[PDB]
Design a protein around this ligand. Structure first.
Ligand code: BOG
Ligand code: BOG
Lengths: 301, 301
């Protein structure tokens, strides 16, 4: 069952039942309420994308350089969330990994439909790779994201094959495409914070037509060739409609010869890292991310 | 684990690794080896379809009329199987249900691509409904099929809304559309008679393009409205890549207010009803089908 702590929270975001502005506001207040751990320096920058000027926030750790750079893509169903609501989580990650984190404000739906978020996410990653020197970031680049952001991170890793050299991909309860059949999707369709009704609404805002469901930049799990992608850490949550599809993607990567550490956090729900001050398991997931990135960037414990 | 009987069989059909003719031959010899239980009368007929003359075999039970009529759509990945290979199973079903069974030779891929099988299956069902008197079949019509045939049966039930009155749908380890993510699909991808490599090959023969994956006549589980469909008996197998998607469809029907009895036969594989002389559980599944149809057609135990 759910951790009693989480059950108590759920019993005590109205996607599709309030205006876009109102749902965005509600999420901002939930996510940004978490404590902001001190980092060494924070800078807001503008990345020149192919289609837009992309805002991003750069977090520097207290540890001395040189650093690896983690590009972070926030979740929120391609519609809600932003860099500022994810500030507490990105600070926590910065401190865990002793690395630079660059959180990207990719274009959101409904204002900008698919593939806008993908284009911005890839363009940002490409620019950061080519400008690692600006961050004393010569130990390399990795990509991470949660939920919709995990989708984007997985897709960026695909698009980066033969263009950039990503060291790692961190997929935090990722969405990996169209799923009408998995047990977790059916079973945890209602009552676990992210619902099927929400999922459907997000999809209706982001995608242009059903054909986009079959585009690998939405459904990376149908990509022709997953071989040669960066090693992955894939975190899933036991009581999450997206659980089975995340674990499916892990299995497909493994079958393609890509190293994958796939870990299911039991007793928790989608979004649990955003709730780290309340949900202890969220702190431990952040710590696991830290371990993996300190090893890949620095060869450190 | 698998029933040891089945493990022993598997250890002792080369889809995609032999010619279409050769795979068809191999399946014919496996399936048609089962005993042919006596029925009262067998007749071959021709049904005038919208696009072709459709061959079908009619089995009459020893019980006296009047009868219900079960339209049966064989499996084989839309490529293999035929009425004659399914003769032993259809005879077994006839005797279990005390009803008329009409087994349909729908057009097969690669010679005829999607939606040919669907068109023939629906046309046959429509003609039988309108000609029940020819079979002393006034107790009504139901639809059934296994695997690819379960797909067709589910789709026929959808297409029949507002056109015909089906009493029941029997979906025997059905395929219900595109699935890149379910646990059963991933876990039982290899070594359980039907494999993912097979599934992919069948799909490549039947579908015209990826867009067909999103057509409700291939993926009934994405249909807009499942309400008002006939009551269902859905049989799944524990060690079957299609298991989770069949159970998903059951859940979606239930949520739409359609009566569903969803039963997972443990310890067995896809196709187990075709192996009834060896696999006892297959005989018991046939018996369950019998119970449900004697009740719906005759209000009998
Ligand atoms: C957590 C965020 C993941 C969102 C996944 C969306 C799954 C696909 O969303 C679907 O696609 C179609 C295209 O708009 C629409 O017809 C439907 O609204 C929706 O069911
Ligand atoms: C047991 C029979 C069920 C067959 C299910 C097929 C699942 C979809 O099949 C897919 O669709 C595409 C269209 O041809 C192809 O690109 C691929 O071959 C295949 O993966």
């Amino acid at each position: 069952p759910l951790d009693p702590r989480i059950k108590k929270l759920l019993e005590s975001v109205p996607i599709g039942k309030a205006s876009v502005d109102e749902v965005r506001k509600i999420f901002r207040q939930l996510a940004s309420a978490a404590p902001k751990a001190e980092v060494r320096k924070v800078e807001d920058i503008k990345i020149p994308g192919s289609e837009t000027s992309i805002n991003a926030r750069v977090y520097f750790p207290k540890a001395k350089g040189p650093y690896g750079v983690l590009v972070y893509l926030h979740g929120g169903g391609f519609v809600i969330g932003d860099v500022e609501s994810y500030d507490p989580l990105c600070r926590a990650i910065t401190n865990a990994c002793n690395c630079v984190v660059v959180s990207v404000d990719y274009r959101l739906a409904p204002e900008y439909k698919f593939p806008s978020a993908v284009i911005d996410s890839f363009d940002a990653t490409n620019w950061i790779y080519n400008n690692l020197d600006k961050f004393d970031g010569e130990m390399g680049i990795a990509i991470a994201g949660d939920s919709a952001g995990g989708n984007l991170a997985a897709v960026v890793a695909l698009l980066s094959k033969g263009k950039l050299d990503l060291k790692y991909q961190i997929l935090i309860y990722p969405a990996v495409g169209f799923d009408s059949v998995s047990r977790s999707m059916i079973e945890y369709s209602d009552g676990f914070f992210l619902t099927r009704e929400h999922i459907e609404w997000f999809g209706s805002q982001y995608l242009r037509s059903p054909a986009d469901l079959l585009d690998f930049r939405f459904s990376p799990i149908i990509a022709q060739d997953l071989s040669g992608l960066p090693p992955a850490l894939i975190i899933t949550a036991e009581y999450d409609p997206l659980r089975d599809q995340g674990e499916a993607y892990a299995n497909r990567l493994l079958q393609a010869g890509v190293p994958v550490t796939s870990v299911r956090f039991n007793n928790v729900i989608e979004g649990f890292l955003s709730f780290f001050p309340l949900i202890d398991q969220g702190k431990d997931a952040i710590g696991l991310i830290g371990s993996v990135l300190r090893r890949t960037f620095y060869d450190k414990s």
